[PDB]
Amino acid sequence: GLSDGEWQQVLNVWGKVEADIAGHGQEVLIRLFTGHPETLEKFDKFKHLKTEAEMKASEDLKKHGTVVLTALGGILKKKGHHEAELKPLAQSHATKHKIPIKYLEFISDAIIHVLHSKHPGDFGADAQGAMTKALELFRNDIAAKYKELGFQ
Ligand code: HEM
């Protein structure tokens, strides 16, 4: 798990996201979709986005980014005591959306990249370490539920 000092860094970094949740969310999803086009195919409602310009112009993509980052923020503020929050997300993403755990790795990496891109020089080495550990814990607990369901 994370130390209290590490959790404090996670939630300090998260204050940057909360100042512009929609912009961070849109950029996270765009980074995921352009870097890994197969992920776009999992969204019926985003398959029509042929270009990054269409993605950036999509108000509904920005809306979903707010949904995604609001959910992640709620989980992070539990500092690892997130079973109730995480279990339904793991179950919807395995059983309904059919999201391989690899794609959650992709989006975790996308979050780290967006943080550096929007806050260059202001996302320190300790902050990246702590946020990475928090995202790894999130992914690992999802993975446990994936394994329970036998989902690949
Ligand atoms: C930080 C990681 C993620 C979080 C917090 C997150 C959160 C959410 C939430 C809260 C919803 C709506 C409620 C639900 O269906 O459970 C949702 C829907 C969805 N998620 Fe995720 N998600 C994440 C990653 C991903 C990834 C990586 C993919 C695919 C590559 C994905 C695919 C989908 C799809 C297809 C839907 C339904 C979209 C629709 O409404 O048409 N999710 N997600």
Greatest distance between any 2 Cα atoms in the chain: 44
Task: Tell me which residue of 107, 133, 140, 106 sits closest to 13, measured CA to CA.
Answer: 133
Counting from 1 in the atom list of ligand 1, the atom nearest the Cα of 138 is: 1
Resolution to 1 decimal place, in Å: 1.4
3-class DSSP state for residue 133? Answer: helix
Which tokens hold the place of 134? 């928090």
Closest of 65, 75, 92 to residue 138, by C-alpha: 75
Which amino acid, residue 73? G
Which residue type is seen at 11?
A: L
* Pair 25, 14: CB distance under 8 Å: no
Distance from the alpha carbon of residue 15 to the mean position of ligand 1, in angstroms: 22
Domains of the chain: residue spans and CATH: 1-152 (1.10.490.10)
What is the C-alpha to C-alpha distance for residues 43 and 87, in angstroms, rounded to an integer? Answer: 21
Residue 3: count of CB within 10 angstroms of its CB:
10
Tokens 């260059």 found at: 120
Question: E strands, 69-129, where?
Answer: none
Whether residue 67 has its Cβ less than 6 Å from ligand 1: yes
Q: Which residue, among 87, 109, 91, 88, has the nearest Cα to 39 in the 3D structure? A: 109
DSSP designation for 95: I
Angstrom distances, CA of residue 92 to CA of 73, 81, 85, 145, 149: 18, 19, 12, 11, 11
